[PDB]
Structure 1
Amino acid sequence: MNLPTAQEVQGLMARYIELVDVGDIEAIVQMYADDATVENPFGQPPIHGREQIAAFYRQGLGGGKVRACLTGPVRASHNGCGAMPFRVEMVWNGQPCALDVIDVMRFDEHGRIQTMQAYWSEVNLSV
């Protein structure tokens, strides 16, 4: 891939959510640039690089069942960026919660995620 087109961004971002839903940590990490950053939630310091990003996804998706689904269409740009709304369902203390999130991503000139920013706060959690 080169810089993804708007259409390619929609496909990549939807792919990403599919990978989160099934919980394929290694497949998620490979979507990222080797030196990518993740800010989760937006407002917290970034994490840097695939090792730290893999640890992030392992922490969240490693154990119990997690589901994730788009809750509206991906909004893509013509500069390799996009934003998408989704919901993550998880068990927290035997307690089924849901978290509503919007991710903003920028992709590099190879089609990998260079930056991810996850907008949400505790008000977006529901038990």
Structure 2
Amino acid sequence: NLPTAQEVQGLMARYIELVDVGDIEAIVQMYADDATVEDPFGQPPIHGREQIAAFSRQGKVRACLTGPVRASHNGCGAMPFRVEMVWNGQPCALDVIDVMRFDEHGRIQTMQAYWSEVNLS
């Protein structure tokens, strides 16, 4: 576990903070070297920092926290946020919620994004 509920909220808030300013470098540093990521949740996961840096690098998108971050007592958290993009010259929003679990060193050991087309406005 390690990170306290109040810490999770801190970490998770920042993660959406780096995603906005587009700091591919910093995000990947919050992840564990052997962290996993299913996004859209369900889909096969991309494990490890390089693969996690490939997707992150691969996909003018702005991120926003639409609600408080829900932190648990065992190092987990979940936050509501929304990504504004542009469907090829067609400004579209995406509502997402990320469910992260941190390790004893305060690193995202796993992340799962919940979203689909029904969340695309």
Asked if these proteins are the same fold (TM beyond 0.5), I'd say yes
CA distance in 2: counterparts of 1:79 and 1:86, whole angstroms: 22
* Pairwise CA RMSD: 1.2
Percent identical residues: 98
Unaligned runs of 5+ in 2: none
**Which secondary structure does the structure 2 equivalent of 1:26 belong to?**
helix
Deviation of residue 91 (structure 1)?
1.6
Name segments (4+ residues, structure 1) moved above 4 Å.
none
Deviations 1:56-108 (A, max 9, x none): 1111xxxx911101000000001000000000001221111100000000000
How far, CA to CA, are the matches of 2:68 and 2:33 in structure 1?
27
Q: Distance in 2 between matches of 1:101 and 1:94?
A: 21
TM-score, scaled to structure 1: 0.92
Per-residue deviation, residues 5-28 of structure 1 (Å, max 9, x unmatched): 000000000000001111100101
- TM-score between the two structures when normalised by the length of structure 2: 0.97
| Total equivalences in the alignment | 121
CA distance in 1: counterparts of 2:61 and 2:78, whole angstroms: 21
List gaps (5 residues or longer) in structure 1: none
Question: In the aligned structure 1, how far is the partner of 2:40 from the partner of 2:84?
Answer: 16
- Select the structure that is richer in helix: 1
CA distance in 2, matches of 1:38, 1:111: 16
